[PDB]
Amino acid sequence: TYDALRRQLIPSFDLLYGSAVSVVAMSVPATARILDLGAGTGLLGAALRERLPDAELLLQDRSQAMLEQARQRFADDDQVAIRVADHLDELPAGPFDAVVSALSIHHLEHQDKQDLFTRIRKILRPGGIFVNVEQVLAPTSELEKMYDRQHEAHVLASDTPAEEWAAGRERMKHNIPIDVETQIQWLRDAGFTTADCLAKDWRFATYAGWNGS
Ligand SMILES: Nc1ncnc2c1ncn2[C@@H]1O[C@H](CSCC[C@H](N)C(=O)O)[C@@H](O)[C@H]1O
Ligand SMILES: [Ca+2]
């Protein structure tokens, strides 16, 4: 039900979450240590577990209520741990092969995003990968209205309950998005040697940075 609603609200959910899973699987070993930052109910972690049965997952979020859903999702999984922490708090030491995030980092001020990317690189192994599945701003107000129309078109085509879309729009008023190429450049500024946009559907994009390759 919850997973079905996320697909209704998020254009190209399968392409964008699937691209995050595929780029991690091509970048890290079967036995990778992975941090899911702002894991919420653990949706991105779950997609990774499906592909990587032998990976160690650490799910981190500031919300105990969201992580209770992650605890239920991963009830019988002996290779999943949960950490309660704000993005702004000290990150877990690691090292990690991958740090992943979906629809969470846009809740930080821009300066805090730039600093977070730098702090993430510090806990990555050499060659390690950072992946973000993210809500991104259009480069102009005119294109932002077109991004919004395309988002609405997906939500309508997906037969989304009107009250859930209204609730979704209200939550997005608190978001601090920026365009995908600005935050990809912030990965270069943070000292990632390669950064790329893997996949994109207007307002939603999957991008990654590599710590040495
Ligand atoms: N400053 C912050 N520090 C940590 N978690 C934060 C945060 N601001 C927002 N979050 C978390 O970010 C999540 C956004 S919803 C996305 C959840 C999950 N990654 C998914 O893909 O479905 C929520 O779980 C919320 O509690
Ligand atoms: Ca949000």
Numbering used by the authors: 17 to 229
Tell me, in the authors' exact words, what the paper reports.
Here, we characterize the O-methyltransferases BelI and CysG, which catalyze the initial step of β-lactone formation. Employing techniques such as crystallography, computational analysis, mutagenesis, and activity assays, we identified a His-His-Asp (HHD) motif in the active sites of the two enzymes, which is crucial for binding a catalytically active calcium ion. As expected, BelI as well as CysGΔN16 adopt the class I methyltransferase Rossmann fold, characterized by a core domain of a seven-stranded β-sheet flanked by α-helices. The HHD-motif enables regiospecific C1-carboxy group methylation of their respective malic substrates.
Due to the high crystallization tendency of CysGΔN16, subsequent mutagenesis experiments were focused on this variant. This approach enabled the production of both full-length and N-terminal truncated mutants in high purity, which were characterized in activity assays and used for structural studies. Conservative asparagine replacements in the HHD motif resulted in CysG variants that remained active. CysGfl-D191N showed a 56% decrease in substrate turnover, while CysGfl-H122N and CysGfl-H123N were fully active compared to wt but were inactivated with EDTA.
